[PDB]
Symmetry: C3
Subunit: 90 residues, 3 copies
C-alpha cells in the first residue's frame, strides 16, 4: 500500500531523476542542482525501474514501466520520450 520508487543520477553536481509508481501512474521528479521540479515523464504503470548512461555530456535514460506482466520501455535521448524496442514474454 506504499508507492514504489526508482532513481538514477549522472555527473558530479549531480543530476538526479526519481520515478514514483502510485496507483498505476508513474511520474518523475528532477534535480539539476538548484531545486526539485516535475519532469516530462508521465506514463501508466504499477512498477518502475530505471537506468541511465552518459555519452560525453549527453544523458540517455531508460525507464521500464510494468502493468501486469507487460513491461514498456521509455527512452530519453535528449529530445523527448519515445517508446523503446524492449520486449519480454512474461
Amino acid at each position: 500500500s506504499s508507492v514504489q520508487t526508482a532513481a538514477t543520477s549522472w555527473g558530479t553536481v549531480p543530476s538526479i531523476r526519481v520515478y514514483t509508481a502510485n496507483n498505476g501512474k508513474i511520474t518523475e521528479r528532477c534535480w539539476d542542482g538548484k531545486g526539485w521540479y516535475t519532469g516530462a515523464f508521465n506514463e501508466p504503470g504499477d512498477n518502475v525501474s530505471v537506468t541511465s548512461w552518459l555519452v560525453g555530456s549527453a544523458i540517455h535514460i531508460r525507464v521500464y514501466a510494468s502493468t501486469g506482466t507487460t513491461t514498456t520501455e521509455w527512452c530519453w535521448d535528449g529530445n523527448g520520450w519515445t517508446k523503446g524496442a524492449y520486449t519480454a514474454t512474461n
Copy 2:
C-alpha cells in the same frame, strides 16, 4: 510478503551498498572488498530505492524511503546521513 531490496556500487574493487525494506524498516549492508557488514543507515520505510555518484574518490549516496505516499530522501556525503530536500506530491 517478501523483503524488497535496492543496490548501488562504486569504484572497481568495488564498494557495494544493499538496502532492504522489511516490515516497514530499511537497513543497509555494506561491502568494501573484505566482507559484508552492517551500515549506519536504519530508517522507516516500506519501499526503498538508491542512487550514488563519485566526485573524485568521494561517494555521495541518496536513498529514497517511502511509507504510504510519503517519500523521504536520505543523503550520505562522507560524514553522516542527513535528510534531503526531495519532495513529491503523491
Copy 3:
C-alpha cells in the same frame, strides 16, 4: 499483481540488462546494441535488485534475489553466474 523489474547498463552503446521477477522466478533480458535477447540468468525470487561496475572493459554484475526474508546474491564476472557471499539477518 504486476511483475517487478530492475535494470542496469554500462558503456556508451550501451549494454543493458533488465531483470523481471514474475510469479517467484527472475529472468533476464539483454541488449548489446542490436536487439533484445534472453540472458543466462534464471533463478527463483519474488523481488530483484541489481548493480554493476566496469573494470576496464570487463563488466561485473550483482543481482540480489529475495524470497521471503532470504536474499541470495548472484555474481557475473565474465565467465558464468556464481553465488555470492552476501548475507543479511532479516
